[PDB]
Design a protein around this ligand. Structure first.
Ligand SMILES: [Ca+2]
Ligand SMILES: [Ca+2]
Ligand SMILES: [Ca+2]
Ligand SMILES: [Ca+2]
Ligand SMILES: [Zn+2]
Length: 316
Protein backbone atom coordinates (compact mmCIF):
# COMPACT_ATOMS: atom_id res chain seq x y z
CA UNK A 1 0.00 0.00 0.00
CA UNK A 2 1.18 3.57 -0.64
CA UNK A 3 1.08 5.82 2.44
CA UNK A 4 2.84 7.47 5.37
CA UNK A 5 5.21 5.52 7.62
CA UNK A 6 4.33 5.60 11.31
CA UNK A 7 4.52 3.67 14.58
CA UNK A 8 1.67 1.90 16.39
CA UNK A 9 1.45 0.03 19.70
CA UNK A 10 0.00 -3.32 20.64
CA UNK A 11 0.26 -6.47 22.72
CA UNK A 12 1.70 -9.81 21.62
CA UNK A 13 0.67 -13.40 22.30
CA UNK A 14 2.34 -13.50 25.72
CA UNK A 15 0.75 -10.20 26.82
CA UNK A 16 3.82 -7.96 26.37
CA UNK A 17 3.46 -4.44 24.93
CA UNK A 18 5.55 -3.50 21.88
CA UNK A 19 5.79 -0.76 19.27
CA UNK A 20 5.37 -1.78 15.63
CA UNK A 21 6.13 -0.10 12.26
CA UNK A 22 2.91 0.59 10.34
CA UNK A 23 1.73 2.53 7.29
CA UNK A 24 -1.18 4.96 7.18
CA UNK A 25 -3.48 5.32 4.19
CA UNK A 26 -7.13 5.64 5.35
CA UNK A 27 -6.51 2.62 7.63
CA UNK A 28 -3.28 1.73 9.51
CA UNK A 29 -1.71 -1.30 7.88
CA UNK A 30 0.86 -3.80 9.11
CA UNK A 31 3.43 -2.73 6.55
CA UNK A 32 6.95 -1.81 7.72
CA UNK A 33 8.71 0.35 5.16
CA UNK A 34 11.91 0.72 7.23
CA UNK A 35 13.36 -2.71 6.44
CA UNK A 36 14.38 -3.52 2.86
CA UNK A 37 11.49 -3.68 0.38
CA UNK A 38 9.10 -4.06 3.33
CA UNK A 39 7.62 -6.42 5.93
CA UNK A 40 3.93 -7.17 5.31
CA UNK A 41 1.51 -9.05 7.62
CA UNK A 42 -1.79 -10.53 6.38
CA UNK A 43 -4.96 -11.93 7.96
CA UNK A 44 -5.88 -15.39 6.65
CA UNK A 45 -9.20 -15.25 8.57
CA UNK A 46 -9.15 -18.94 9.62
CA UNK A 47 -9.03 -20.06 5.95
CA UNK A 48 -6.25 -21.76 3.97
CA UNK A 49 -6.27 -19.41 0.99
CA UNK A 50 -3.04 -17.36 0.99
CA UNK A 51 -1.97 -14.78 1.64
CA UNK A 52 -5.31 -13.35 2.73
CA UNK A 53 -5.83 -9.60 3.30
CA UNK A 54 -3.12 -7.10 4.26
CA UNK A 55 -3.78 -6.38 7.94
CA UNK A 56 -5.74 -3.12 8.35
CA UNK A 57 -6.65 -1.37 11.58
CA UNK A 58 -8.68 1.77 12.28
CA UNK A 59 -6.68 3.39 15.07
CA UNK A 60 -3.09 2.09 15.09
CA UNK A 61 -3.55 0.37 18.49
CA UNK A 62 -3.37 -3.48 18.48
CA UNK A 63 -4.66 -4.67 21.85
CA UNK A 64 -7.49 -7.01 20.76
CA UNK A 65 -6.87 -10.73 21.35
CA UNK A 66 -7.41 -11.32 17.58
CA UNK A 67 -4.53 -8.86 16.95
CA UNK A 68 -1.90 -10.63 19.07
CA UNK A 69 -0.51 -13.16 16.57
CA UNK A 70 -0.21 -10.43 13.91
CA UNK A 71 1.67 -8.12 16.30
CA UNK A 72 4.27 -10.79 17.03
CA UNK A 73 4.58 -12.07 13.45
CA UNK A 74 5.25 -8.52 12.27
CA UNK A 75 7.64 -7.57 15.08
CA UNK A 76 9.64 -10.80 15.13
CA UNK A 77 10.11 -10.76 11.36
CA UNK A 78 11.69 -7.28 11.84
CA UNK A 79 13.98 -8.57 14.63
CA UNK A 80 15.11 -11.48 12.41
CA UNK A 81 15.77 -9.08 9.51
CA UNK A 82 17.88 -6.94 11.88
CA UNK A 83 19.91 -9.92 13.09
CA UNK A 84 20.86 -11.01 9.57
CA UNK A 85 21.68 -7.45 8.47
CA UNK A 86 23.62 -6.36 11.56
CA UNK A 87 25.41 -9.62 12.34
CA UNK A 88 25.99 -11.23 8.91
CA UNK A 89 25.59 -8.30 6.52
CA UNK A 90 22.78 -10.02 4.64
CA UNK A 91 19.86 -7.94 3.37
CA UNK A 92 16.71 -10.11 3.71
CA UNK A 93 16.50 -13.79 2.73
CA UNK A 94 17.61 -13.38 -0.91
CA UNK A 95 20.40 -10.96 -0.06
CA UNK A 96 18.69 -8.28 -2.19
CA UNK A 97 16.12 -6.95 0.33
CA UNK A 98 13.21 -9.12 -0.78
CA UNK A 99 9.90 -8.27 0.91
CA UNK A 100 8.97 -10.52 3.83
CA UNK A 101 5.29 -11.57 3.92
CA UNK A 102 3.56 -13.49 6.73
CA UNK A 103 -0.04 -14.63 7.20
CA UNK A 104 -1.60 -15.34 10.60
CA UNK A 105 -4.84 -17.05 11.67
CA UNK A 106 -4.25 -19.78 9.07
CA UNK A 107 -6.93 -22.52 9.21
CA UNK A 108 -8.62 -23.53 12.49
CA UNK A 109 -6.77 -25.01 15.49
CA UNK A 110 -3.66 -25.52 13.36
CA UNK A 111 -0.68 -26.66 15.33
CA UNK A 112 2.19 -25.57 13.09
CA UNK A 113 3.95 -22.73 11.28
CA UNK A 114 5.98 -22.90 8.06
CA UNK A 115 7.83 -21.15 5.24
CA UNK A 116 6.02 -22.23 2.05
CA UNK A 117 8.69 -21.10 -0.41
CA UNK A 118 7.14 -17.64 -0.86
CA UNK A 119 5.97 -16.50 2.60
CA UNK A 120 5.55 -17.35 6.27
CA UNK A 121 2.36 -19.01 7.52
CA UNK A 122 1.30 -19.36 11.19
CA UNK A 123 -1.52 -21.33 12.79
CA UNK A 124 -3.18 -20.28 16.05
CA UNK A 125 -2.65 -23.68 17.75
CA UNK A 126 -5.53 -25.60 19.38
CA UNK A 127 -4.90 -23.83 22.69
CA UNK A 128 -3.73 -27.04 24.39
CA UNK A 129 -0.75 -28.25 22.38
CA UNK A 130 0.15 -24.77 21.16
CA UNK A 131 -0.86 -21.11 21.42
CA UNK A 132 -0.41 -18.91 18.32
CA UNK A 133 2.97 -19.91 16.93
CA UNK A 134 4.22 -16.43 16.09
CA UNK A 135 4.56 -15.78 19.84
CA UNK A 136 7.86 -17.79 19.77
CA UNK A 137 10.83 -15.74 18.48
CA UNK A 138 12.82 -18.97 17.92
CA UNK A 139 9.94 -20.39 15.82
CA UNK A 140 9.70 -17.23 13.67
CA UNK A 141 13.48 -17.12 13.13
CA UNK A 142 13.60 -20.89 12.54
CA UNK A 143 11.06 -20.54 9.71
CA UNK A 144 12.61 -17.42 8.16
CA UNK A 145 15.99 -19.17 8.13
CA UNK A 146 14.41 -21.78 5.78
CA UNK A 147 14.04 -18.89 3.31
CA UNK A 148 17.78 -18.09 3.68
CA UNK A 149 18.67 -21.75 3.08
CA UNK A 150 16.41 -21.90 0.04
CA UNK A 151 18.30 -19.01 -1.59
CA UNK A 152 21.78 -20.24 -0.64
CA UNK A 153 22.68 -23.93 -0.11
CA UNK A 154 19.25 -25.14 -1.28
CA UNK A 155 19.33 -28.23 0.95
CA UNK A 156 16.61 -30.70 -0.15
CA UNK A 157 14.01 -31.52 2.52
CA UNK A 158 14.68 -35.21 2.98
CA UNK A 159 17.14 -37.61 4.58
CA UNK A 160 20.47 -36.17 5.85
CA UNK A 161 20.28 -32.99 3.81
CA UNK A 162 16.78 -32.27 5.25
CA UNK A 163 18.08 -32.88 8.77
CA UNK A 164 20.90 -30.38 8.15
CA UNK A 165 18.26 -27.94 6.80
CA UNK A 166 16.24 -28.33 10.02
CA UNK A 167 19.30 -28.02 12.31
CA UNK A 168 20.44 -24.84 10.55
CA UNK A 169 16.98 -23.37 11.24
CA UNK A 170 17.15 -24.39 14.92
CA UNK A 171 20.70 -22.99 15.30
CA UNK A 172 19.87 -19.58 13.82
CA UNK A 173 16.42 -19.55 15.52
CA UNK A 174 18.31 -19.88 18.80
CA UNK A 175 20.92 -17.27 17.92
CA UNK A 176 18.15 -14.78 17.13
CA UNK A 177 16.55 -15.50 20.50
CA UNK A 178 19.87 -14.71 22.18
CA UNK A 179 20.33 -11.56 20.02
CA UNK A 180 16.93 -10.23 21.16
CA UNK A 181 17.83 -11.46 24.66
CA UNK A 182 14.25 -12.65 25.09
CA UNK A 183 14.89 -15.00 28.05
CA UNK A 184 17.35 -17.04 25.91
CA UNK A 185 18.00 -20.78 26.03
CA UNK A 186 18.95 -23.78 23.89
CA UNK A 187 15.40 -25.24 23.67
CA UNK A 188 12.99 -24.78 20.69
CA UNK A 189 9.46 -23.47 20.97
CA UNK A 190 9.17 -23.27 24.73
CA UNK A 191 7.18 -19.98 24.73
CA UNK A 192 4.27 -21.36 22.68
CA UNK A 193 4.22 -25.12 23.26
CA UNK A 194 1.82 -26.65 25.88
CA UNK A 195 0.47 -23.63 27.83
CA UNK A 196 -0.56 -25.87 30.76
CA UNK A 197 2.78 -27.62 31.40
CA UNK A 198 5.85 -25.59 32.58
CA UNK A 199 9.43 -26.31 31.55
CA UNK A 200 9.20 -28.39 28.36
CA UNK A 201 9.63 -27.56 24.66
CA UNK A 202 9.45 -29.18 21.23
CA UNK A 203 13.12 -30.01 21.00
CA UNK A 204 16.29 -29.45 22.97
CA UNK A 205 19.69 -28.62 21.42
CA UNK A 206 21.64 -29.09 24.66
CA UNK A 207 20.12 -32.53 25.28
CA UNK A 208 18.15 -33.82 22.30
CA UNK A 209 17.50 -37.17 24.03
CA UNK A 210 15.26 -35.51 26.67
CA UNK A 211 12.46 -35.64 24.07
CA UNK A 212 13.73 -38.79 22.46
CA UNK A 213 15.78 -37.41 19.55
CA UNK A 214 19.19 -38.86 18.72
CA UNK A 215 22.36 -37.24 20.11
CA UNK A 216 24.82 -39.50 18.26
CA UNK A 217 25.08 -40.77 14.63
CA UNK A 218 24.87 -44.36 15.82
CA UNK A 219 21.30 -43.64 17.04
CA UNK A 220 20.00 -41.96 13.85
CA UNK A 221 16.53 -42.80 12.55
CA UNK A 222 16.66 -44.72 9.26
CA UNK A 223 12.96 -45.17 8.32
CA UNK A 224 10.66 -43.13 6.06
CA UNK A 225 8.49 -41.19 8.52
CA UNK A 226 8.95 -37.38 8.67
CA UNK A 227 10.70 -37.28 5.26
CA UNK A 228 13.41 -39.68 6.45
CA UNK A 229 13.60 -38.21 9.98
CA UNK A 230 14.32 -34.51 9.20
CA UNK A 231 12.98 -33.30 12.58
CA UNK A 232 14.49 -36.27 14.45
CA UNK A 233 18.01 -36.58 13.05
CA UNK A 234 18.56 -32.80 13.34
CA UNK A 235 19.25 -33.60 17.01
CA UNK A 236 22.71 -34.95 16.06
CA UNK A 237 23.75 -31.68 14.44
CA UNK A 238 22.02 -29.54 17.07
CA UNK A 239 24.05 -31.29 19.79
CA UNK A 240 27.25 -30.67 17.80
CA UNK A 241 26.40 -26.96 17.50
CA UNK A 242 25.66 -26.69 21.24
CA UNK A 243 29.04 -28.33 22.03
CA UNK A 244 30.91 -26.00 19.68
CA UNK A 245 29.37 -22.97 21.43
CA UNK A 246 29.21 -24.06 25.03
CA UNK A 247 31.61 -27.00 25.32
CA UNK A 248 31.19 -30.19 27.35
CA UNK A 249 32.06 -33.86 27.39
CA UNK A 250 29.76 -36.11 25.35
CA UNK A 251 30.16 -39.91 25.06
CA UNK A 252 33.64 -39.44 26.55
CA UNK A 253 34.80 -36.82 24.04
CA UNK A 254 35.70 -33.38 25.47
CA UNK A 255 35.04 -30.11 23.58
CA UNK A 256 36.19 -26.61 24.54
CA UNK A 257 33.42 -24.08 23.81
CA UNK A 258 34.19 -21.10 21.57
CA UNK A 259 30.95 -19.11 22.11
CA UNK A 260 27.79 -18.23 20.19
CA UNK A 261 29.19 -15.47 18.00
CA UNK A 262 31.86 -17.72 16.45
CA UNK A 263 29.32 -20.56 16.16
CA UNK A 264 27.14 -18.19 14.09
CA UNK A 265 30.06 -17.03 11.89
CA UNK A 266 31.21 -20.59 11.19
CA UNK A 267 27.77 -21.95 10.27
CA UNK A 268 26.70 -18.89 8.22
CA UNK A 269 29.87 -19.20 6.14
CA UNK A 270 29.35 -22.97 5.74
CA UNK A 271 25.76 -22.43 4.61
CA UNK A 272 26.49 -19.62 2.14
CA UNK A 273 29.80 -20.80 0.68
CA UNK A 274 30.16 -24.59 0.92
CA UNK A 275 26.87 -26.49 1.31
CA UNK A 276 25.02 -27.83 -1.72
CA UNK A 277 21.49 -29.23 -2.09
CA UNK A 278 22.47 -32.87 -1.41
CA UNK A 279 25.14 -32.38 1.27
CA UNK A 280 25.19 -35.11 3.92
CA UNK A 281 26.41 -34.95 7.53
CA UNK A 282 29.97 -35.84 6.57
CA UNK A 283 30.03 -32.97 4.04
CA UNK A 284 28.67 -30.60 6.71
CA UNK A 285 31.60 -31.53 8.98
CA UNK A 286 34.01 -30.75 6.12
CA UNK A 287 32.25 -27.45 5.36
CA UNK A 288 32.35 -26.35 9.01
CA UNK A 289 36.02 -27.28 9.37
CA UNK A 290 36.90 -25.39 6.17
CA UNK A 291 34.82 -22.40 7.31
CA UNK A 292 36.60 -22.26 10.65
CA UNK A 293 39.92 -22.64 8.82
CA UNK A 294 39.08 -19.65 6.60
CA UNK A 295 38.11 -17.41 9.51
CA UNK A 296 40.51 -18.46 12.29
CA UNK A 297 43.46 -20.44 10.80
CA UNK A 298 44.00 -24.21 10.41
CA UNK A 299 45.80 -24.47 13.76
CA UNK A 300 43.26 -22.46 15.75
CA UNK A 301 41.35 -23.59 18.84
CA UNK A 302 38.22 -22.87 16.76
CA UNK A 303 39.05 -25.55 14.17
CA UNK A 304 39.97 -27.94 16.99
CA UNK A 305 36.62 -27.42 18.71
CA UNK A 306 34.65 -28.03 15.52
CA UNK A 307 36.45 -31.35 14.93
CA UNK A 308 35.98 -32.48 18.51
CA UNK A 309 32.29 -31.65 18.44
CA UNK A 310 31.62 -33.72 15.29
CA UNK A 311 33.71 -36.53 16.79
CA UNK A 312 31.59 -36.43 19.96
CA UNK A 313 28.39 -37.02 17.92
CA UNK A 314 30.05 -39.68 15.75
CA UNK A 315 30.16 -37.76 12.46
CA UNK A 316 33.33 -38.26 10.46
CA1 LIG B 1 -7.14 -1.15 16.70
CA1 LIG C 1 13.41 -18.74 25.71
CA1 LIG D 1 14.15 -21.13 22.73
CA1 LIG E 1 4.91 -25.71 27.95
ZN1 LIG F 1 12.00 -26.27 9.94
Amino acid sequence: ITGTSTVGVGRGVLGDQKNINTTYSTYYYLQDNTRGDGIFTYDAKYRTTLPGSLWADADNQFFASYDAPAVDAHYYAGVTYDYYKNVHNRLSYDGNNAAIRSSVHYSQGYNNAFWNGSEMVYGDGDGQTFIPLSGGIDVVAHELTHAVTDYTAGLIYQNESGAINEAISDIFGTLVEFYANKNPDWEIGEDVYTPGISGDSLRSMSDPAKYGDPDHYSKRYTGTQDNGGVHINSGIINKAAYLISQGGTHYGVSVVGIGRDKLGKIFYRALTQYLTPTSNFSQLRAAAVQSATDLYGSTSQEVASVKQAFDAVGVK
